Amino acid sequence: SDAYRLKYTFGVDFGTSYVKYGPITLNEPKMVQTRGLFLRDLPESVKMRIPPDVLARGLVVGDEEVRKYLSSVRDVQRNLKYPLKDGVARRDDEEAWRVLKELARYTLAQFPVSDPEFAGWLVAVALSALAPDYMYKAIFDIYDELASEFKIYAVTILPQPLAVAIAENAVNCVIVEGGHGNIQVAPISFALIREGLVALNRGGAEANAITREILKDIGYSDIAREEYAVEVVKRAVGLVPRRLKEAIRAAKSDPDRFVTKVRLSPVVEVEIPREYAWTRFLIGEIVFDPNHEEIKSYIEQSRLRIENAVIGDVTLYGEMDVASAIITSLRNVSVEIQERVASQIILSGGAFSWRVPPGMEDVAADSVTRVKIALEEKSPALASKVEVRLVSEPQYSVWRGAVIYGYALPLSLEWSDTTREGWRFP
Amino acid sequence: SDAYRLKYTFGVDFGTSYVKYGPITLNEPKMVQTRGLFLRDLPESVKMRIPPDVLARGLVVGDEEVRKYLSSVRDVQRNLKYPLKDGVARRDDEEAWRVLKELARYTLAQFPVSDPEFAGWLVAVALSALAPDYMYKAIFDIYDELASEFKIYAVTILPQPLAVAIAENAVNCVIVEGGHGNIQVAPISFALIREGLVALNRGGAEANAITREILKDIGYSDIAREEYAVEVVKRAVGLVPRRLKEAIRAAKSDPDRFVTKVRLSPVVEVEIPREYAWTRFLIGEIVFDPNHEEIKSYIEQSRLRIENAVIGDVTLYGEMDVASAIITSLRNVSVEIQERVASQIILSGGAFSWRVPPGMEDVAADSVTRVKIALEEKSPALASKVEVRLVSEPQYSVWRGAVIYGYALPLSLEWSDTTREGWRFP
Amino acid sequence: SDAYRLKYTFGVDFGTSYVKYGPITLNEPKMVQTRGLFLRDLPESVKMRIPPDVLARGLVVGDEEVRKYLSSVRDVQRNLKYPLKDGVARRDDEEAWRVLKELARYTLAQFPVSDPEFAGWLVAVALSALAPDYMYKAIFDIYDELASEFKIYAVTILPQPLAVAIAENAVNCVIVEGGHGNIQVAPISFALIREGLVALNRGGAEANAITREILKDIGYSDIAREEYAVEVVKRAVGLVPRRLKEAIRAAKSDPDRFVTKVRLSPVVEVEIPREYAWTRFLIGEIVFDPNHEEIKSYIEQSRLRIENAVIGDVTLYGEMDVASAIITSLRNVSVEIQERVASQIILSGGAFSWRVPPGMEDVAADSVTRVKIALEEKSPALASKVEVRLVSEPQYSVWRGAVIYGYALPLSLEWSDTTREGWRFP
Ligand SMILES: Nc1ncnc2c1ncn2[C@@H]1O[C@H](COP(=O)(O)OP(=O)(O)O)[C@@H](O)[C@H]1O
Ligand SMILES: Nc1ncnc2c1ncn2[C@@H]1O[C@H](COP(=O)(O)OP(=O)(O)O)[C@@H](O)[C@H]1O
Ligand SMILES: Nc1ncnc2c1ncn2[C@@H]1O[C@H](COP(=O)(O)OP(=O)(O)O)[C@@H](O)[C@H]1O
């Protein structure tokens, strides 16, 4: 039906960090941190303390639902699984979708529907652009299973940048998503340019890993293991330089500006010492231009120490700067239209967030000011006409696009594997 | 069976001082002071006076059973064996378990069962967290031998802090056991955190040894040798300072407040003189924070005199404060949950008992008020939100947890050496 | 000059345990156990007994120089500072470099130079790969101060694995250092692969801490506090299993093979009892593969007891096996060359030492045989072609590389912070 959509059209975003979800009726979507928590090796002592309903399905997911079941850090680095490592779950990983299943299951269960006119939801999923074929097939399999439990009339999937352009309803610009895992820049002329869509393998999660290194170098290593901890630290102590080299010089001259103290929990309060105060810049900068002799040295000597198993989640080989990303995304649109499409740049998603702490504007920079000054370095003639803008409520964006897309996607259009578009029915 | 448990589930605690025991049916457990009494070198004169049944097994154990067989102090410091010196019996000591055997034998024999429906007990043992592997294997060997005498259907063992958390059924807090021998602090989130469990090697028995030194300095040394004597003295004359340095200053200014007279027996009545009246504080304080230039001097110069053999049971090297213990136990749980788990602090066990004698509240402090003020000194930001509580009937606690754990521990779960959990059958 | 180098080129290694040092002229370097001994709280009684020269600088360092100033164990666990806890001194610790200063000062003072042609030394320092930026800057500050005292023409610093590859002058292999604090595995093709260099945070010092636990479980705890004591015990009683599980099974079947008696001092002679005889394996094994349900249980229940302050120096979260370390270090070199570079494996450094005591070869294994059988478990196809070798004089190695590197490092090459290579001049 039609007005049936304005109620029961149900958007879902995944991305890496937060799974943003809700029906179209919401003003802004509810969030679930993507982490699933396994309950797997349990001393029968603790199984006595777990409700047999929760332990039955073998996981728990959601912000509040997991917090209650969290044991010590050793438990966290084991049984707390962040699937969607970057935008994507490796096929071979059974634990990867096992959480996504009950993460998606948690999503719908959160919103019951009393109305007997309810024929089942309309589930608009927004995956990352990097999502391969199997990740589509896998997640439709997920919602096919929830069809037996919940009422789902139809399921669709849209690439994440497609949502944002729909969310902004912007006519001419290059969308840039700050997605935690991946940065997806797409130009849009009258709509997405699928050929010009460019999605980096880098994201906010690379700002964690550059923080997760700092907290190891300060001797907080117990804190590093817990991903929530570096999150709070990164978000609080992370900072974006105007120009990295000029900034680090500044922070080594007058560190007292940059020394910060973050209270994670009453026991553990992270003090960024006087010396490393300049490393605050590497935290927020590595999202944008992770090519510098200053970072690429600091990341290299931080790749040496291998604590548990992982060598660290980050790439030593170097990536493309989001300045160079936007440019590369534009060379794929037509020279006719490039003057128009390169006018606006919409920054969106999480990793473009950073707010300059007050009084520090002479050195730090907002994500907006960063991109604008990033273009001046590479393509000067471009940065003249560029008006770069950050979305209001950056991370809520993709979901707002997911429902609008999900709202108008004529329901007689079947999902066909070849076109990778349209509804599928259970 | 099931309702069979609500009767014949049988909890046993050991700990150092009192072995707390009984079936689940009891309101509070019966106690046996852990002391075994050897009858070993007996002039045939006295063997004539001993029933040949008692002398046959070579020991006696229990409060009333030993009192009748106690000879002079020389006999007490010899043939009265306190096993479980701290939480643990050294493997090499045959006398150590030989008492525990007949101490555990005394425990079950105390409770005969008339009902022919009785298939044997369910013995839930609570050992100290410090109990090594052999101490588990040794005590199962004990109950395997009592299987031939008594009816024991199944035997299990739980670490002592696991009991308390079950006894309190507290969801978020850090348990602190005042166990006579050892202080075992564990955080609990939905249940014990085995990684965060921290057990000090210090306990109430270190408050004896600091009293046992005082009674030597007052010239009562005949009284010191008898462990029951310092017990009654410690419990009566022992006291817990608000702040040790401020307190000792007070007690040296106005000693008449603190001069006390304890009647042990009609012959021997201990008068804490006017001078040492300040040493009452070191008695109760050394349980909490045994690092002070005032104690660590007094314990050092009291380590010099070596009377019989032992140099004294106490550590000159210094230990961790229970304030620092709780903190160290929290750094092992996840920064996510630390805000919640650090809220409540449950004090339990014997060594957190002390009651301020009336009118003295301006200087002394209850164990509760002591811990709360202990945290303010170390981790100020923690002590703001901390609500610290003492268990009603502090020492009875562990047993109450031992039965509940012993009540539900599904009986098809075998004891497996690797997991160190579950029932074993004889 | 040139031939001036063949005399006055002066190598210095730090590492954790032994600081190996000497001029290039030596056959093998002289050693200094890294321990500094503070003289800090001294009763004026003892200051009368200390030469005012020694007490002036406030420390003493060196094997013989400290032995003479050692008081009781309480003094040792306080005023005997092992800096470089693992490979690294925490910035905030003033006591950390204060020893390194006079430790390095002790080093040069040991070797006076009579020749008036002597223009000052050439100091080649070998730090650990984990050495951060500040640890470089700190130690150059050290040698800048010794420039006023001694004659130092030039100072350089090389990462420790760089030395070994130079010391061996091996063309194709993966160096593995058994460094007391840390295990640094690097592949070398025509030289070090800085990207493939992988340095574990585990080392011989984790074999102490697993012995330091054993000596607490045997009741020698007075002996545990003294790091020299566990050293001699570890080196003597420590043993490396062929396969840990198969070995522990063997040692619990026939303990009389493994019961050992080590004479530390005429008073104290450590008898590893019959029972724990199997724990000899955990001593030497935890260097290699500290992931086992057998160790990771024994280390966990040994982390509970906290004696003085420290919870114990060791990581409960688990580390990477040196088998998996070598593999992870190879995935960073190019698939073209991996066939060649994975041929030889040079084991080096202290923690790869262990000699099977005679007649026990059926169960124990040399460090060589251990690594070779370690690879067979993980990467079978690799272990076929692998020829693994241990350096002759394992621990002397890094210094031998330090001088050769220090010998040819063209002196017109300045130290530049960015490249982290080359000479600096005072
Ligand atoms: N105030 C902030 N400053 C810096 N980074 C932030 C801030 N708030 C959120 N973030 C980052 O944004 C990320 C959220 O992005 P997200 O929408 O999950 O991307 P996607 O869902 O596409 O993977 C978080 O992982 C976090 O690291
Ligand atoms: N009123 C009191 N004041 C101070 N200490 C007390 C008091 N009552 C009991 N105690 C101490 O508590 C101890 C009992 O603790 P207990 O339960 O035996 O510990 P565990 O059993 O774990 O070893 C006794 O040794 C005694 O010293
Ligand atoms: N025979 C031996 N058996 C086992 N371990 C040994 C033996 N000899 C020395 N070791 C260990 O080797 C270590 C020396 O390594 P070292 O060269 O100090 O490493 P680094 O200097 O890189 O820190 C000592 O700490 C000791 O524990």
Handedness of CA A164, A166, A169, A170 (dihedral sign): positive
How far is residue A213's CA from residue B331's CA, in Å, rounded to a whole number?
Answer: 19
Residues with Cβ within 8 Å of residue B75, at least 6 apart in sequence: none
Alpha helices in C189-321 (DSSP H): 205-217, 221-224, 227-237, 244-253, 279-285, 295-304
Largest CA distance in chain A: 70
State the best of C75, C80, C275, C301 to mutate against chain B, taking most chain B CBs within 10 Å. C301
Q: What angle do CA B286, B288, B289 make, to 5 degrees?
A: 75
How far is residue B336's CA from residue B338's CA, in Å, rounded to a whole number?
Answer: 6
- Reading the block at residue B155, the tokens are 């035997």
Contact A177, A160 (CB under 8 A): yes
Q: Which CATH number fits domain A169-392: 3.40.50.1970, 3.30.420.570, 3.40.50.150, 3.40.50.300?
A: 3.30.420.570
Concatenating the DSSP letter of every residue in B203-272 gives: -THHHHHHHHHHHHHTT-HHHHT-HHHHHHHHHHH---BSSHHHHHHHHHH-GGGT--EEESSSS-EEE-
CA atoms within 13 A on the CB side of C222: 10
Q: Is residue B17 part of an annotated ligand binding site? A: yes
Contact C152, C406 (CB under 8 A): no
- Nearest protein CA to atom 10 of ligand 3, as residue: C350
- The total of other beta-carbon atoms located within 10 Å of residue B35's CB is 23
| Residue with tokens 């239209």, as numbered in its chain | A337
How far is residue C216's CA from residue C212's CA, in Å, rounded to a whole number?
Answer: 6
Pairing assessment for the beta strands A173-177 and A184-188 based on DSSP bridges: antiparallel
Among candidate residues C208, C207, C252, the one with its CA nearest the CA of residue C226: C208
Resolved by: cryo-EM
Does C162 lie at the interface with A, CB-CB under 8 angstroms?
Answer: no
Cα distances from A205 to residues A27, A58, A314, B361, in angstroms, run 27, 27, 8, 55
Contact B131, B413 (CB under 8 A): no
Residues with Cβ within 8 Å of residue B266, at least 6 apart in sequence: none
- The total of other beta-carbon atoms located within 10 Å of residue A314's CB is 20
- Nearest protein CA to atom 22 of ligand 1, as residue: A179
Contact A102, A57 (CB under 8 A): yes
- Reading the block at residue B106, the tokens are 């005394």
Among candidate residues A170, A179, A137, the one with its CA nearest the CA of residue A15: A179
- Reading the block at residue A121, the tokens are 């939801």
Output phi, psi for A122, to 5 deg.
-120, 110
Q: What angle do CA B50, B53, B54 make, to 5 degrees?
A: 60
How far is residue B214's CA from residue B223's CA, in Å, rounded to a whole number?
Answer: 11
Coil vs helix vs strand at B202: coil
Report chain B's terminal Cα–Cα distance, integer Å. 17
Q: Give the Å distance between the CA of C126 and the centre of ligand 3.
A: 16
Among candidate residues A184, A179, A83, A177, the one with its CA nearest the CA of residue A138: A83
How far is residue B157's CA from residue B129's CA, in Å, rounded to a whole number?
Answer: 11
Residues of A in contact with B408 (CB under 8 A): 48
Contact C316, C213 (CB under 8 A): no
Residues with Cβ within 8 Å of residue C276, at least 6 apart in sequence: C214, C217, C218
C96: part of which helix (H) or strand (E)? helix C94-109
How far is residue B235's CA from residue B354's CA, in Å, rounded to a whole number?
Answer: 8
Q: Give the Å distance between the CA of A384 and the centre of ligand 1.
A: 29
Cα distances from B47 to residues A183, A317, B58, B62, B283, in angstroms, run 90, 87, 11, 20, 40
Residue C138 DSSP symbol: H
Residues of C in contact with A301 (CB under 8 A): 132
Among candidate residues A80, C69, C304, the one with its CA nearest the CA of residue B194: C304
Residues of B in contact with C219 (CB under 8 A): 90
Output phi, psi for A380, to 5 deg.
-55, -45
Specify the length of chain C in residues.
Answer: 426
B residues 24-83 near C, CB within 8 Å? none
Q: Is residue C353 part of an annotated ligand binding site? A: yes
Handedness of CA A6, A7, A9, A15 (dihedral sign): positive
Does C345 lie at the interface with A, CB-CB under 8 angstroms?
Answer: no
- Reading the block at residue B379, the tokens are 């981790």
- Reading the block at residue C312, the tokens are 């114990």
How far is residue C27's CA from residue C6's CA, in Å, rounded to a whole number?
Answer: 13
A51: left (phi over 0), alpha (psi -120 to 50) or beta: beta
A7: part of which helix (H) or strand (E)? helix A3-8
Pairing assessment for the beta strands C344-348 and C387-390 based on DSSP bridges: parallel
* Mutation choice for ligand 2 from B12, B16, B176, CB with most ligand atoms inside 8 A: B16
Concatenating the DSSP letter of every residue in A47-105 gives: HTTS-HHHHHHSEEESHHHHHTT--BHHHHHHHEE---TTS---TT-HHHHHHHHHHHH
- Nearest protein CA to atom 19 of ligand 1, as residue: A179
Q: Do domains B1-168+393-426 and B169-392 have the same CATH topology?
A: yes
Query: Which amino acid appears at position C122 of this protein?
Result: L
Among candidate residues A133, A137, A132, A196, the one with its CA nearest the CA of residue A161: A196
Q: Give the Å distance between the CA of C211 and the centre of ligand 1.
A: 45
Q: Is residue B354 part of an annotated ligand binding site? A: yes
Q: Which CATH number fits domain A1-168+393-426: 3.40.50.800, 2.30.330.10, 3.30.930.10, 3.30.420.40?
A: 3.30.420.40
Is residue B5 exposed (0-12), middle (13-18) or buried (19+ Cβ within 10 Å)?
middle
Contact A128, A199 (CB under 8 A): yes
| Residue with tokens 């067979």, as numbered in its chain | C376
Contact A176, A322 (CB under 8 A): yes
Report chain A's terminal Cα–Cα distance, integer Å. 17
Residues of A in contact with B191 (CB under 8 A): 45-46, 48-50, 71
Report chain C's terminal Cα–Cα distance, integer Å. 17
C95: part of which helix (H) or strand (E)? helix C94-109
Residues of A in contact with C159 (CB under 8 A): none
Query: Which amino acid appears at position A332 of this protein?
Result: N
Q: Where are the beta strands (DSSP E) in A128-275?
A: 152-159, 173-177, 184-188, 198-199, 261-263, 269-271
C23: part of which helix (H) or strand (E)? strand C18-23
Coil vs helix vs strand at C36: strand
Residues with Cβ within 8 Å of residue A216, at least 6 apart in sequence: A224, A302, A305, A307
B11: part of which helix (H) or strand (E)? strand B9-13
CB contact under 8 A, A273 and C319: no
Handedness of CA B178, B183, B187, B190 (dihedral sign): negative
B residues 177-236 near C, CB within 8 Å? 194-195, 197-201
How far is residue B257's CA from residue B250's CA, in Å, rounded to a whole number?
Answer: 10
Residues with Cβ within 8 Å of residue A399, at least 6 apart in sequence: A11, A12, A13, A20, A21, A22, A29, A126, A163, A167
How far is residue A139's CA from residue A89's CA, in Å, rounded to a whole number?
Answer: 11
**Closest approach of chain C CAs to the CA of A278, in angstroms?**
13
How far is residue C61's CA from residue C67's CA, in Å, rounded to a whole number?
Answer: 9
Q: Is residue A329 part of an annotated ligand binding site? A: no
How far is residue B140's CA from residue B401's CA, in Å, rounded to a whole number?
Answer: 20
Cα distances from A18 to residues A36, A157, B251, in angstroms, run 12, 17, 60
DSSP β-bridge partners for residue C156: C124
Handedness of CA C111, C114, C120, C122 (dihedral sign): negative
Contact C89, C122 (CB under 8 A): no
Residues with Cβ within 8 Å of residue C201, at least 6 apart in sequence: A305, A306, A307, C86, C130, C182, C315, C319
C206: left (phi over 0), alpha (psi -120 to 50) or beta: alpha
**Closest approach of chain A CAs to the CA of C223, in angstroms?**
29
Among candidate residues B293, B306, B284, B417, the one with its CA nearest the CA of residue B354: B284
Among candidate residues C94, C93, C100, C106, the one with its CA nearest the CA of residue C128: C100
Sorted by where each begins, the domain ranges of chain B are 1-168+393-426, 169-392
How far is residue B274's CA from residue B254's CA, in Å, rounded to a whole number?
Answer: 9
Radius of gyration of chain A from its Cα atoms, rounded to whole angstroms:
22
Contact C120, C153 (CB under 8 A): yes
Dihedral of CA atoms C178, C181, C183, C188 in degrees, nearest 10, equals: -80
How far is residue B28's CA from residue A162's CA, in Å, rounded to a whole number?
Answer: 68
- Reading the block at residue B403, the tokens are 């039965």
Q: Give the Å distance between the CA of A348 and the centre of ligand 1.
A: 10
- Reading the block at residue B287, the tokens are 């349980």
How far is residue C201's CA from residue C206's CA, in Å, rounded to a whole number?
Answer: 9
Output phi, psi for A64, to 5 deg.
-75, -35
Contact A173, A190 (CB under 8 A): no
- Reading the block at residue A186, the tokens are 């797409």
Using the CB atoms, write b or e for C196-224: b if 16+ within 10 Å. Answer: bbbbbbbbbbbbbbbbbbbbbbbebbebb
Cα distances from A232 to residues A183, A227, A263, A360, C262, in angstroms, run 21, 9, 9, 20, 51
Output phi, psi for A194, to 5 deg.
-65, -25
Cα distances from C162 to residues A300, C321, C348, in angstroms, run 16, 22, 12
How far is residue C211's CA from residue C238's CA, in Å, rounded to a whole number?
Answer: 8
State the best of B86, B90, B91 to mutate against chain C, taking most chain C CBs within 10 Å. B91
Is residue A242 exposed (0-12), middle (13-18) or buried (19+ Cβ within 10 Å)?
middle
Specify the length of chain A in residues.
Answer: 426
- Reading the block at residue B102, the tokens are 């007949």
Residues with Cβ within 8 Å of residue A321, at least 6 apart in sequence: A288, A289, A290, A291, A374, A378
Among candidate residues B205, B201, B230, B227, the one with its CA nearest the CA of residue B215: B230
How far is residue C283's CA from residue C290's CA, in Å, rounded to a whole number?
Answer: 10
How far is residue B348's CA from residue B173's CA, in Å, rounded to a whole number?
Answer: 12
How far is residue B171's CA from residue B165's CA, in Å, rounded to a whole number?
Answer: 8
Does A261 lie at the interface with C, CB-CB under 8 angstroms?
Answer: no
User: Can you say how many angstroms the Cα of residue A213 is from the centroid of all Cα atoms in its chain?
Assistant: 20
Question: Subunits with at least 3 CB pairs below 8 A relative to chain C?
Answer: A, B
Handedness of CA B129, B132, B137, B142 (dihedral sign): negative
Among candidate residues C290, C336, C342, C289, the one with its CA nearest the CA of residue C316: C290
Residues of C in contact with B194 (CB under 8 A): 300
How far is residue B319's CA from residue B332's CA, in Å, rounded to a whole number?
Answer: 19
How far is residue C395's CA from residue B123's CA, in Å, rounded to a whole number?
Answer: 55
Handedness of CA A35, A39, A41, A47 (dihedral sign): positive
Query: Which amino acid appears at position B407 of this protein?
Result: Y
Concatenating the DSSP letter of every residue in B100-156 gives: HHHHHHHHHHTS----TT---EEEEEEE-TT--HHHHHHHHHHHHHHHHHS-EEEEE
How far is residue C180's CA from residue C203's CA, in Å, rounded to a whole number?
Answer: 5
How far is residue A74's CA from residue A420's CA, in Å, rounded to a whole number?
Answer: 41
Angle between helices C227-237 and C205-217 (to 10 degrees): 90
Using the CB atoms, write b or e for A54-76: b if 16+ within 10 Å. Answer: ebeeebbbbeeebbebbbbbbbb
Among candidate residues B135, B89, B118, the one with its CA nearest the CA of residue B10: B118
B281: part of which helix (H) or strand (E)? helix B279-285
Coil vs helix vs strand at B322: helix
Among candidate residues B121, B199, B190, the one with its CA nearest the CA of residue B159: B199
Among candidate residues A345, A399, A353, the one with its CA nearest the CA of residue A374: A345
CB contact under 8 A, A77 and C317: yes
Residues with Cβ within 8 Å of residue A66, at least 6 apart in sequence: A33, A35, A36, A37, A60, A80
Output phi, psi for B12, to 5 deg.
-140, 125
How far is residue B128's CA from residue B135's CA, in Å, rounded to a whole number?
Answer: 10
How far is residue C60's CA from residue C70's CA, in Å, rounded to a whole number?
Answer: 10
Among candidate residues A52, A222, A71, A55, the one with its CA nearest the CA of residue B189: A71
Cα distances from C420 to residues A297, A375, C157, in angstroms, run 10, 31, 8
What is the chain C residue with the closest CA to B131?
C301
Does C311 lie at the interface with A, CB-CB under 8 angstroms?
Answer: no
How far is residue A55's CA from residue A35's CA, in Å, rounded to a whole number?
Answer: 17
- The total of other beta-carbon atoms located within 10 Å of residue A301's CB is 20
